[PDB]
Amino acid sequence: LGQEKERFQVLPGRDKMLYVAAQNERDTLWARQVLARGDYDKNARVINENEENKRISIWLDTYYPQLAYYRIHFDEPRKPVFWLSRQRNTMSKKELEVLSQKLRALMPYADSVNITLMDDVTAAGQAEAGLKQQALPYSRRNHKGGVTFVIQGALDDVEILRARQFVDSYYRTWGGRYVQFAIELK
Amino acid sequence: LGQEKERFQVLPGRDKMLYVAAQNERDTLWARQVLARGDYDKNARVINENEENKRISIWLDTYYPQLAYYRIHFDEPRKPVFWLSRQRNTMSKKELEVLSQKLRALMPYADSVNITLMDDVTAAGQAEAGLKQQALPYSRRNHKGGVTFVIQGALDDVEILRARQFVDSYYRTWGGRYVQFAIELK
Amino acid sequence: LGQEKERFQVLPGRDKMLYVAAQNERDTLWARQVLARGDYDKNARVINENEENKRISIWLDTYYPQLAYYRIHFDEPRKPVFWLSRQRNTMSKKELEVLSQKLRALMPYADSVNITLMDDVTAAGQAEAGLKQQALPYSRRNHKGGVTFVIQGALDDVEILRARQFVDSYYRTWGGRYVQFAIELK
């Protein structure tokens, strides 16, 4: 990979394909272009966290429709970590091993998929803390199966930016399936 | 290094790579350019305190998410010092040796990473003292898990500058994870 | 040194480097330029009191952070004198010999570094006397760990100049860590 060794990871697939793991969309596009140039399109794929999370969510929409979960993390791409709700889980260890097996089959570059339970109260508390940290007025509204944090009042361009970066960061960690943020409209 | 011996340090890595330690961003960019010219990009890396602190923080966000800490200092780059909260520490000596080991692995140029406990009350007091030194009006607001110092009133261009330099200096020493500064908006 | 024998001193270093001691910034710049011309940059350094005081202060900020001190004087550059607070000293003779040893190592051109205790009440009294000498109105404000002298009223261009020269002189002798001067704003 050369000077690109820090941006990308090449992983072997169970499907005999090669996977290039990228860190963002701009690297993903560029990497796909390089592939589409040397004609490796049929033999290699470029992956990223955001796309893979969307792709697996589609599959879950049809196979595990009532599933209470957060997000998959790929800090170690050969061993992704699937974050599930601790409070809202209904499945036994055996059923969770089945899910993990089916997730592995969907990600040919993954040795295994670890299912890890995450606390809902913690999920919402980390959202609150980040808003308190920036002395942002907000209302926490608890609904059935989620929480909305409504950010209130006017904010300057800097504060609008700093709040957007917090929100973006939160979603990258937790996904947008449980806690959501919104901006007050008056 | 020649006439550059005072700005940079060359350190060997456990990964067989060479590390050039720089003092600021402008030296870091220039040093990377020199490397990108002689084609040492694949064999040498340029490091600085600010970038390394951000890089390790990312890793801690996922592996030690509840960790109460300040900052890593590199006054001796082969032996960085990781400043942890004395009051908010929950880990035993053994758990702190584990952390230190994992920090070492992340910094191939470090012989060891020393974990040092720093007093929260001291952290906030040094922030206060620096504001008192400049006869700056401020409110200290104690929150849960932090302190905000809100600098009040109008200030002339010189005083705005001298307050920014204090704040910048404070953050370089302590990081921005516990004590924060803000400017009053009226 | 020739006609330059009165402006500069050449001192040998323990590090095998040669040190040129200069009296001001303009001589320091000029001396560095001469060196950067004959290619002695890698073998000789130019030093001055102001820069050396800043350089050692940085080191003390991290190694002796609570240290109550004034300034280092180089009237005899091979034997600098480090002025410490007599009232606010907490260290024993042994601890002060340790400090002196570490200061020596930081100044390869110094045979030894003498640590000398200076009286805080004397430090503030010399500030007062110099202001009384010029029939300057002022308020002495005693704070915790320092004194501010606030110079009051309007002054003509000559008096503004004479007060600036006193202040500049004071700081050169005592540093700016204990007594500070300020100008009243009305």
Q: What is the secondary structure topology, with strand pairs?
A:
The structure is cut from a larger assembly and holds 3 copies of chain A (186 residues).
Chain A: E1 9-12, E2 18-21, H1 25-38, E3 44-47, H2 49-63, E4 69-73, E5 81-85, H3 93-106, E6 114-118, H4 120-133, E7 138-143, E8 146-151, H5 157-174, E9 179-183
Helix pairs in contact in A: 4-5
Provide an overview of this structure:
The structure is cut from a larger assembly and holds three copies of chain A (186 residues). Helices cover 40% and strands 24% of the residues of chain A. Chain A is of the alpha/beta class. In chain A, the strands form three sheets. A three-stranded mixed sheet of chain A has the order 1-2-3. In chain A, helix 4 (120-133) runs antiparallel to helix 5. The A-B interface holds A 2-3, 5, 73, 75, 129, 132-133, 135, 173 and B 36, 41-42, 61-62, 143-146, 148, 180, 182. Chains A, B, C: This is Protein PrgH.
Q: Largest interface, counted with CB-CB under 8 A?
A: A-B, 10 and 12 residues
Distance between the termini of chain A: 52 Å
Count every beta strand of chain A, where a strand is a DSSP E run of 2 or more residues: 9
Beta-strand percent range of chain A: 15-25%
Largest sheet of chain A: 3 strands, mixed
Helical percentage of chain A: 40-55%
The H/E string of chain A reads: EEHEHEEHEHEEHE
Categorize the overall geometry of chain A.
Answer: flat
Instruction: Determine Rg of chain A (CA atoms, Å).
Output: 19 Å
**Helix/strand/pairing category of chain A:** alpha/beta
Strand line-up across the major sheet of chain A: 1-2-3
Count of DSSP-assigned helices of chain A: 5
Q: Give the oligomeric state.
A: part of a larger assembly
Function (chains A, B, C): Required for invasion of epithelial cells.
Subcellular location (chains A, B, C): Cell membrane
Organism (chains A, B, C): Salmonella typhimurium (strain LT2 / SGSC1412 / ATCC 700720)
Protein name (chains A, B, C): Protein PrgH
